[PDB]
């Protein structure tokens, strides 16, 4: 979760809301 570049797998932060972030932009971090 959260909003940048880099698969979400790569490091794992704690965002919760990532979840229900229902735009096309699940999965990835800053």
Same mark, same amino acid.
């Given at each position: 979760? $959260? $909003?940048? !570049? /880099?698969?979400? =797998?790569? &490091?794992? !932060?704690?965002?919760?809301?990532? &979840?229900?972030? +229902? &735009? !096309? +932009? /699940? $999965?990835? =971090? +800053?």
């Amino acid at each position: 979760g $959260g $909003g940048g !570049p /880099t698969p979400e =797998y790569f &490091l794992m !932060p704690i965002d919760p809301a990532w &979840l229900q972030a +229902n &735009l !096309p +932009n /699940t $999965g990835k =971090y +800053n």
